[PDB]
Amino acid sequence: EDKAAVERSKMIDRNLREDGEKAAREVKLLLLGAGESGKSTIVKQMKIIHEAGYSEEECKQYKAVVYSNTIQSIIAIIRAMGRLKIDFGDSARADDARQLFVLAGAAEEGFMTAELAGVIKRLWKDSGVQACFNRSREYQLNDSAAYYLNDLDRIAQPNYIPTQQDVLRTRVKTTGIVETHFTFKDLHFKMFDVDFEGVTAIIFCVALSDYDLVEEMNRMHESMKLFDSICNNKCFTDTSIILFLNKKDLFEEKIKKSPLTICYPEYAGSNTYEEAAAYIQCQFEDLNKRKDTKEIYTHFTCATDTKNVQFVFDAVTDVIIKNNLKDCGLF
Ligand SMILES: Nc1nc2c(ncn2[C@@H]2O[C@H](COP(=O)(O)OP(=O)(O)O)[C@@H](O)[C@H]2O)c(=O)[nH]1
Ligand SMILES: [Cl-]
Ligand SMILES: [Cl-]
Ligand SMILES: [Cl-]
């Protein structure tokens, strides 16, 4: 954005400070959205992209988290089979299912051995297990279940070291409000992941692939309600409201087989990625009560995709530079 460079070059407030050219222009960014919408993943991406990121030794720290998530995923599927009354493809997998629970049951924390890897591999290749997997909207299953289970052989190797993508795919139970700092285009970002005064911008995350998920309340509806409060809150009048319609990769896969009408019974468009995503975007943007005063800046994201997040965050920063710089202090 040549317009961004020009816009920021119009500022003169550094001149009022003795060492103004060395001062830090600060941007305060609130990262919001329902649980599992992708907030932590965006935080990790900011570290990877703008701060070098996740070194091998750092990645190693996530090994047992990867194991934990993998064990949780397969157990979720196996348990759901009993509830949905889905039989194993090969009755022999029943012994493996039992063994899964024996091994997870006796251990202290996530782990992986050859024996466990074999049990999980055989379960995951079984046709009943796959049929239950494909009905995951009917229970609660980690988004990254397939990612880890399909790569089990690599993850189970004795000298396994998690990759960045392995780390980005983890589900980690975070609580409270976490602040991270990073500098990009010479802006000093202060990012708060809320699981606020002077907020320059809000990035609001939505899991697109929640549309067909729940117990007796639709997860997308809840995200809408939450965006509604936020977008029209008086405190955020001058705040740039950025909307990340996230998990577009998972959404693209689901929409082929699971109709949007599950979420919006009135939807009468085609069940294609293009029409259904557009419709969701319109549903969210329509919650904006001040359409003549405030614009929503919407992006379709895959938060685990570093190149996608770098591209999007670049566009978001140019919007901030063009609209909000005058409200950003020097420190
Ligand atoms: N496939 C896919 N997985 C994602 C995406 N965004 C987040 N995830 C995964 O979804 C899970 C929940 O994301 P997380 O960042 O922890 O959500 P948070 O509760 O808002 O902090 C994690 O396992 C992430 O790796 C996405 O765009 N695509
Ligand atoms: Cl069973
Ligand atoms: Cl072993
Ligand atoms: Cl991209």
At 144, which CATH number? Answer: 1.10.400.10
Using a 10 angstrom Cβ sphere, with 0-12 exposed, 13-18 middle and 19 or more buried, the burial of residue 106 is exposed
Looking at the structure, tell me whether residues 63 and 93 fall in a common domain.
yes
CA 264 to chain CA centroid, Å, is 22
Using the 3D structure, point to which of 147, 173, 199 is the last residue of a domain: 173
Looking at the structure, tell me whether residues 127 and 210 fall in a common domain.
no
Looking at the structure, tell me whether residues 246 and 183 fall in a common domain.
yes
> How far is it, in rounded angstroms, from Cα 323 to Cα 59?
37
115 CA distance to ligand 3 centroid (A)? 7
Looking at the structure, tell me whether residues 240 and 297 fall in a common domain.
yes
Q: Which residues of 9-39 are buried (b: 16+ CB within 10 A; e: fewer)?
A: eeeeeeeeeeeeeeeebbbbbbbbbbebbbb
The pocket around ligand 1, CB under 6 angstroms, is made up of 33, 35-41, 143-144, 168-171, 205, 246-247, 249-250, 302-304
**Ligand 1, atom 7, residue with closest C-alpha:** 38
Looking at the structure, tell me whether residues 105 and 207 fall in a common domain.
no
Strands (E) located in the chain: 25-33, 177-184, 187-194, 201-207, 240-246, 296-300
Using the 3D structure, point to which of 125, 151, 173 is the last residue of a domain: 173
Looking at the structure, tell me whether residues 160 and 146 fall in a common domain.
yes
> How far is it, in rounded angstroms, from Cα 272 to Cα 257?
10
Give the technique used to solve this structure. X-ray
Query: Is the distance from CB of 233 to CB of 289 less than 8 angstroms?
Result: no
Looking at the structure, tell me whether residues 67 and 153 fall in a common domain.
yes
Looking at the structure, tell me whether residues 193 and 322 fall in a common domain.
yes
> If you compute the radius of gyration of the chain from its CA atoms, what whole number of angstroms results?
23
Q: 3-class DSSP state for residue 299?
A: strand
Using the 3D structure, point to which of 126, 151, 173 is the last residue of a domain: 173
For the chain, what is the domain count?
Answer: 2
Using a 10 angstrom Cβ sphere, with 0-12 exposed, 13-18 middle and 19 or more buried, the burial of residue 219 is buried
Looking at the structure, tell me whether residues 246 and 181 fall in a common domain.
yes
Show the domain range for 87.
55-173
Looking at the structure, tell me whether residues 178 and 289 fall in a common domain.
yes
CATH of the domain at 43: 3.40.50.300
Q: Tell me the C-alpha to C-alpha distance, in Å, between residue 203 and each of 13, 17, 161, 226, 245.
A: 27, 31, 32, 13, 10
Query: Is the distance from CB of 33 to CB of 205 less than 8 angstroms?
Result: yes
> How far is it, in rounded angstroms, from Cα 97 to Cα 79?
9
85: left (phi over 0), alpha (psi -120 to 50) or beta: left
Looking at the structure, tell me whether residues 165 and 184 fall in a common domain.
no
Altogether, the residues listed in the chain come to a count of 331
110 CA distance to ligand 3 centroid (A)? 14
Task: Read off the DSSP letter of residue 24.
Answer: P
- In one-letter notation, the amino acid at residue 141 is L
Looking at the structure, tell me whether residues 263 and 146 fall in a common domain.
no
Query: Is the distance from CB of 168 to CB of 309 less than 8 angstroms?
Result: no
